[PDB]
Amino acid sequence: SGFRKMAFPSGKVEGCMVQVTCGTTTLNGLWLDDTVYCPRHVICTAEDMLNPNYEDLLIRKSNHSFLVQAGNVQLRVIGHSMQNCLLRLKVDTSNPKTPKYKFVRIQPGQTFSVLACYNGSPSGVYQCAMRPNHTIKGSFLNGSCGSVGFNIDYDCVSFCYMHHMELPTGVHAGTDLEGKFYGPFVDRQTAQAAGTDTTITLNVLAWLYAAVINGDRWFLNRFTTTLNDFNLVAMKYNYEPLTQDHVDILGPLSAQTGIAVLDMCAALKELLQNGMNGRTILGSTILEDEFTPFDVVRQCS
């Protein structure tokens, strides 16, 4: 009773949010044990934006060009290294609130929870699916890059996504927690654009069940049909154009069975389309047109 988009309780993951600074520029990062992962573009200035050389810009950065910090309780950056699209940054202490955790790599169609953060501080949790095209339709404003997405998996937090960019479309790209981008995209402000979408069916069926469970099942009791719609199939299958008059003649029966014509019609409307399938109406495996409607009122009161 009730169905709303629900995000996993952010508690465990908040514990891990810190901000990372490369003199002026400020992402947020993930503090786990003694490593702090964060997008590798933090080592930039909105000058290298266009199409940066990371391996170069990183190799000119000291070990303490990095001011990591959590609450305040500042952390000094003992080591650092670029791992795909993240920086590792090992820190001088370990998050005493690292939870049980994992770096799964979600698969298109799988929802996860997102923890929009700004300068290392919570703010918002909402629910997202990784579209089949490899974007996700999030809500991310500036200085949120490094926000993460996670799923809870029994006692263990399974991080699956960290946030890098946004396509002109209005969607968002990003990487798994091992620096690999979800998709074709790369972290440079050079106008890429997203594949074409398509809906995820599995999740629409899953959603459909949800509706059943919550007492919405009309869509099961299926169809009724419009007359001109039928006569299309009627003509296809060499049946005789069903007409207004016919529908009346039938009345009397359509009444006392309870099943009005156009519905019964949807029933014939493809009893021909796709067979009787092994089964039998009135001991018959074909459809039987050799009975008028009076013939049937006649043979039973």
């Binding site: 934006m49 960019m165 890429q192």
Partner: peptide
């Protein structure tokens, strides 16, 4: 629009 946030 490609836009690294």
């Amino acid at each position: 629009x490609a836009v690294l946030x």
